Design a protein around this ligand. Structure first.
Ligand SMILES: *[C@@H]1O[C@H](CO)[C@@H](O[C@@H]2O[C@H](CO)[C@@H](O)[C@H](O)[C@H]2NC(C)=O)[C@H](O)[C@H]1NC(C)=O
Ligand SMILES: *[C@@H]1O[C@H](CO)[C@@H](O[C@@H]2O[C@H](CO)[C@@H](O)[C@H](O)[C@H]2NC(C)=O)[C@H](O)[C@H]1NC(C)=O
Ligand SMILES: *[C@@H]1O[C@H](CO)[C@@H](O[C@@H]2O[C@H](CO)[C@@H](O)[C@H](O)[C@H]2NC(C)=O)[C@H](O)[C@H]1NC(C)=O
Ligand SMILES: N[C@@H](Cc1c[nH]c2ccccc12)C(=O)O
Ligand SMILES: N[C@@H](Cc1c[nH]c2ccccc12)C(=O)O
Ligand SMILES: *[C@@H]1O[C@H](CO)[C@@H](O)[C@H](O)[C@H]1NC(C)=O
Ligand SMILES: *[C@@H]1O[C@H](CO)[C@@H](O)[C@H](O)[C@H]1NC(C)=O
Ligand SMILES: *[C@@H]1O[C@H](CO)[C@@H](O)[C@H](O)[C@H]1NC(C)=O
Ligand SMILES: *[C@@H]1O[C@H](CO)[C@@H](O)[C@H](O)[C@H]1NC(C)=O
Ligand SMILES: [Ca+2]
Ligand SMILES: [Ca+2]
Ligand SMILES: [Ca+2]
Lengths: 499, 512
């Protein structure tokens, strides 16, 4: 059961996992004139492979520490989703293969990345009460506990992002904008929340459009026609890189400049949009980012992968091949095997901060500490029936979920990690700016403030306007009002139809 | 296996089924202090039982006719979903149980009602390329063929409904309304489309709220207060009966009267809201409806039910118990000789068949897809090299391919064919809620239609002479946020308020 390439290790306790190794699937048509065959995957995601190694590192750090879960070993079974629902469902059917009835059971799943994939996986995982701990899903629809009974996450939701964007617009005195969002369960609720917030602060919106990764030519042309027919220089986008690339390509080949973008977290640091060829269009973007944690011995673990020594990993071979443009054997030169991964610039060991990787780390330690709480329990002071402890020899999924619901522990950085009613965390935000490197010629992200989620309303945002390059060259705030303000000797008037 | 309650029969080809026999599940939630049990369904839906009987009737009619499918017999396997995702997922896992690994396979499935349930079912059914035909799901999110490969339906989507509501509001000139929607995949896209159209037509919307079947007291109280403060008389609702009942209960308890409700097809005929004691609030509602059909011999088959002769129907015993307030023993004891006509229930208390006619069409659609595979000639086929499939060993994707190229004639002399998004087209009927003078009861009276086959601006037709506003009044209400400027005067601006609301200032001296 399950797909062919996988990261698998045996042990007393087995943990699941879903990571987007590939960016997407093939644009194919199957008019069913023959028996259908399995779809393929196209592009290679080096960021996703880095997230995969964080879970392995956390598990192997737990197994080597006698203070956490002694006399017990943890395994894993990690698959690939290709950013599609169907592959995730194929893997999940293997996750719950024994509960529906030679395959070990699953007690915890480190959830997917996309919101739609997470929803589709959770709808099936909630039947058997198997906890799922996501690390990048920030939709507000997953906070509903009537439908998703066993969903937890280590990332905050998207209400504060919309509120902060409205706060920025109010801060810089703009009242004429336009909105774009992806066509999924992550973009639509967020853009709706932003519209709800902006209606109260008297901000008028000109156009609203929806995009998708599989949009045809005559839906991109219409969207880019609507954009250039407007007089608003401020555009708000709730989408990811794969869902935004075609529109950006079309805009670039048309050479449309002068717009100001307010990026969400999904594409704030995406490598598909932050390209020097696009700088004369996407330059000067303002976006949001999370707070970066610390993992001490992580670079050494990343810099010791090998297609032959990493027998437990099935993605290492393709990582080597895609990195070195080389072909392994059991145009493309043959692989010697002694090549060095430090000589190639890829989003694998070329990073400045760890944000989602820290989330994977935290999810694995949350599961481990729930298991530890099960382990070190005194009978008569438990959490089940008349007060009892669950046996660590025969632990089940729902007991782990119950312990996760009542979790409180201090991480390696010296701060508590507690899950709220709907299994969410609250955290700070960091506001960044897109610059141009003077020496290397790449794109540099620079912090220009922060968003405080603890302070009172109206005292949260903090902007250092002195360090904002408005288009990479400008040092003056853009004008984005619909009409010029009247003077002392005049008054206002009404234009029929217009807001 | 799956759930214990079911209705199945042996045959060469088996069809699936998903009907909402109940309205919902129990309100109990576990604290995870013990092993969780199976959730239980609470209310009984007499409308959902009628739709199942339509599928059974269609199959039994096909088996008797030699012209349609000789030498082949159709069975069935029908489950209950209770308007819940988990039950439907369990039933669907039972449907595809053979293909995960003795178990017969399911050629086709007649889909669910709710869009949220249908999406969850289709996500799992699309892996195995099993065709699914829905009779009530009408969300536009299900028209994306890049995700739902094998979804088909016999009901139009809601874009035309939203445009029709905008046209109705434009016909009776109002520019100050409100909107209420359900928090699922059905009410959100429709309300977004309506907001787009209303902004296009220069109509101002005051508020916008979201409700759900499991909303607590504070949310309902906040929603009602929002409606109370605003002066917008006209309210537009995109939801169903179960999701709207708590709000209507709270409003009726607080006695808020005078609003004009525009109703979607989901609750324009629901028996949970169309009640005589709600009339002083929901009276005079204007809503949409589908087009009725004819199924001769249906009522007799409906009236020949019994909890003993129905060997193949496991839902009949609870039907009898609920109908006669009895208890069958293997609450008085059941004699078993009572008359169905004695008890007045939504089972046979109907006037037109509108959703139960879609089940008929779905069953004949699958039947005609199998007649095409059955009868063909070598070199004349939809598959590779012009070859034909094997009727003796037929697969699901062949049925899907033949469904994508289907063109047949209904019983009542009209054509059916499906678009390449698996959707259909049809007209609408606009009804008005009255009060019957003989028996106090809501009565729906048709006042106009919406010809979807016409050009823009010539589709809506409304007869005003048969509309009773608020159920008694004969005068068109008023909703504009501002009294009209009379003459010799100028518009004004009020700060912080929409352009729909002005001040009516007088002109300067020497002008006109
Ligand atoms: C979230 O951000 C706020 C401000 O950005 C943090 O508050 C700061 O806390 C440090 C140390 O406690 C103080 O030295 C600063 O003066 C605080 N800033 C302000 C504006 O009061 C807060 O600690 C952050 N939260 C977390 C969990 O790190
Ligand atoms: C663009 O419009 C905004 C609001 O429409 C203007 O913000 C006003 O700024 C003045 C002076 O700073 C304040 O007295 C007003 O209260 C602000 N408006 C509101 C609604 O608070 C802004 O000045 C305009 N910018 C330009 C360049 O005209
Ligand atoms: C309520 O407002 C609507 C539009 O804001 C009014 O409709 C206008 O009516 C005048 C004549 O009274 C026509 O000349 C306009 O063409 C109408 N506008 C549109 C867009 O159709 C309506 O009359 C107002 N109601 C009342 C009672 O005055
Ligand atoms: N929050 C996104 C997922 C996401 C977060 N960060 C990302 C970075 C890259 C790609 C996707 C993401 C969603 O729900 O859809
Ligand atoms: N169109 C509805 C389905 C529906 C039609 N009539 C109904 C009556 C009751 C409940 C649901 C329905 C939906 O998308 O969900
Ligand atoms: C595109 O627009 C920029 C900005 O004005 C201009 O400098 C450039 O010449 C244009 N054409 C290109 C980049 O081919
Ligand atoms: C978690 O435990 C620490 C231990 O002192 C305590 O200070 C903190 O308040 C606890 N967190 C919650 C949410 O109770
Ligand atoms: C369907 O069949 C009818 C009658 O054979 C024919 O007139 C029509 O062109 C066919 N196709 C469509 C799309 O209706
Ligand atoms: C809709 O109504 C028009 C006119 O009333 C009619 O010509 C057309 O055939 C109808 N279509 C359907 C699908 O009923
Ligand atoms: Ca250990
Ligand atoms: Ca306008
Ligand atoms: Ca206002």
């Amino acid at each position: 059961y399950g797909p062919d390439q996988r990261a698998q290790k045996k042990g007393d306790i087995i943990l699941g996992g879903l990571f987007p190794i590939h960016f997407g699937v093939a644009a194919k048509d199957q008019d069913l004139k023959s028996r259908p065959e399995s779809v393929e995957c196209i592009r290679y995601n080096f960021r996703g492979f880095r997230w995969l190694q964080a879970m392995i590192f956390a598990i192997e750090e737990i197994n080597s520490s006698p203070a956490l879960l002694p006399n017990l070993t943890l395994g894993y079974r990690i698959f690939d989703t290709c950013n599609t629902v169907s592959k995730a469902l194929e893997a999940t059917l293997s996750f719950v293969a024994q509960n529906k009835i030679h395959i070990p059971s699953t007690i915890a799943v480190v959830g997917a990345t996309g919101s739609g994939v997470s929803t589709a996986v959770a709808n099936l995982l909630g039947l058997f009460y198997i906890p799922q701990v996501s690390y990048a899903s920030s939709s507000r629809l997953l906070s509903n506990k009537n439908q998703f009974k066993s969903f937890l996450r280590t990332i905050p939701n998207d209400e504060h992002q919309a509120t902060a964007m409205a706060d920025i617009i109010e801060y810089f005195r703009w009242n004429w904008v336009g909105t774009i969002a992806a066509d999924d369960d992550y973009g639509r609720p967020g853009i709706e929340k932003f519209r709800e917030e902006a209606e109260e602060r008297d901000i008028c919106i000109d156009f609203s459009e929806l995009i998708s990764q599989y949009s045809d030519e005559e839906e991109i042309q219409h969207v880019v026609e609507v954009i250039q027919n407007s007089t608003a220089k401020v555009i708000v986008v709730f989408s990811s890189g794969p869902d935004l690339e075609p529109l950006i390509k079309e805009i670039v080949r048309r050479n449309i400049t002068g717009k100001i973008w307010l990026a969400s977290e999904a594409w704030a640091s995406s490598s598909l949009i932050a390209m020097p060829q696009y700088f004369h269009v996407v330059g000067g973007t303002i976006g949001f980012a999370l707070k970066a944690g610390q993992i001490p011995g992580f670079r050494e673990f990343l810099k010791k992968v090998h297609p032959r020594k990493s027998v437990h990993n099935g993605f290492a071979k393709e990582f080597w091949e895609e990195t070195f443009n080389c072909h392994l054997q059991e145009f493309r030169p043959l692989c010697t095997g002694d090549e060095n991964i430090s000589s190639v610039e890829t989003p694998y060991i070329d990073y400045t901060h760890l944000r989602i990787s820290y989330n994977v780390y935290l999810a694995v330690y949350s599961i481990a500490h729930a298991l530890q709480d099960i382990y070190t329990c005194l009978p008569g002071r438990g959490l089940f029936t008349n007060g009892s402890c669950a046996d660590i020899k025969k632990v089940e999924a729902w007991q782990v979920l119950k312990h996760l619901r009542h979790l409180n522990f201090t991480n390696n950085m010296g701060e508590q990690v507690t899950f709220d009613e709907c299994g969410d965390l609250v955290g700070n935000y960091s506001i960044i700016n897109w610059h141009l490197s003077p020496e290397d010629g790449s794109i540099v992200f620079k912090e220009v403030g922060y968003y405080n989620v603890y302070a009172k309303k109206g005292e949260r945002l903090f902007i250092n306007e002195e360090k904002i390059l408005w288009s990479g060259f400008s040092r003056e705030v853009p004008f984005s009002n619909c009409s010029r303000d009247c003077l002392a000797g005049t008054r206002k008037g009404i234009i029929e139809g217009e807001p | 296996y799956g759930p214990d309650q079911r209705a199945q029969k042996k045959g060469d080809i088996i069809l699936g089924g998903l009907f909402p026999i109940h309205f919902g599940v129990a309100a109990k939630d576990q604290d995870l202090k013990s092993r969780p049990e199976s959730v239980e369904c609470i209310r009984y839906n007499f409308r959902g039982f009628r739709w199942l009987q339509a599928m059974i009737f269609a199959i039994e009619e096909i088996n008797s006719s030699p012209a349609l499918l000789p030498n082949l017999t159709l069975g069935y396997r029908i489950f209950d979903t209770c308007n819940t995702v988990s039950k439907a997922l369990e039933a669907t896992l039972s449907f595809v149980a053979q293909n995960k690994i003795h178990i017969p396979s399911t050629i086709a499935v007649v889909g669910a009602t709710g869009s949220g349930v249908s999406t969850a079912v289709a996500n799992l059914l699309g892996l195995f390329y099993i065709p699914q035909v829905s009779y009530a799901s009408s969300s536009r999110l299900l028209s994306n063929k890049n995700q739902f490969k094998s979804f088909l339906r016999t009901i139009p989507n809601d874009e035309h409904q939203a445009t029709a509501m905008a046209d109705i509001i434009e016909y009776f000139r109002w520019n100050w309304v409100g909107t209420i929607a359900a928090d699922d995949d059905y009410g959100r896209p429709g309300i977004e489309k309506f907001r787009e159209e209303a902004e296009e037509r220069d109509i101002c919307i005051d508020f916008s709220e979201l409700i759900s079947q499991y909303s607590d007291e504070e949310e309902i109280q906040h929603v009602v207060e929002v409606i109370q403060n605003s002066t917008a008389k006209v309210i537009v609702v995109f939801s169903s009966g179960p999701d709207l009942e708590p709000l209507i209960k709270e409003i009726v308890r607080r006695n808020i009267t005078g609003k004009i409700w525009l109703a979607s097809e989901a609750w324009a005929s629901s028996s949970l809201i169309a009640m005589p004691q709600y009339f002083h609030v929901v009276g005079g509602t204007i809503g949409f409806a589908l087009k009725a059909g004819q199924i001769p011999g249906f009522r007799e088959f409906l009236k020949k039910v019994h909890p003993r002769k129905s060997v193949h129907n496991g839902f009949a015993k609870e039907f009898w118990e609920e109908t006669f307030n009895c208890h069958l023993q293997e609450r008085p004891l059941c004699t078993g000789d009572e008359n169905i006509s004695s008890v007045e229930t939504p089972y046979i208390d109907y006037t037109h068949l509108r959703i139960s006619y879609n089940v008929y069409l779905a069953v004949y659609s699958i039947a005609h897809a199998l007649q095409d595979i059955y009868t063909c000639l070598p070199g004349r086929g939809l598959f590779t090299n012009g070859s034909c499939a094997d009727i003796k060993k037929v697969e699901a994707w062949q049925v899907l391919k033949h469904l994508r190229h289907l063109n047949f004639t209904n019983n009542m002399g009209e054509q059916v064919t499906f678009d390449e998004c698996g959707d259909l087209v049809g007209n609408y009927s606009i009804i008005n809620w009255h009060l019957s003078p003989e028996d106090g009861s809501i009565v729906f009276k048709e006042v106009g239609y919406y010809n979807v086959y016409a050009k823009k601006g010539e589709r809506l037709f409304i007869n005003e002479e048969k509309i009773l506003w608020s159920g008694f009044s004969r005068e068109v209400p008023f909703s504009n946020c501002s009294r009209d400027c009379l003459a010799g005067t100028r518009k004004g601006i009020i700060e912080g308020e929409p352009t729909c609301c002005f001040e009516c200032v007088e002109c300067p001296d020497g002008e006109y």
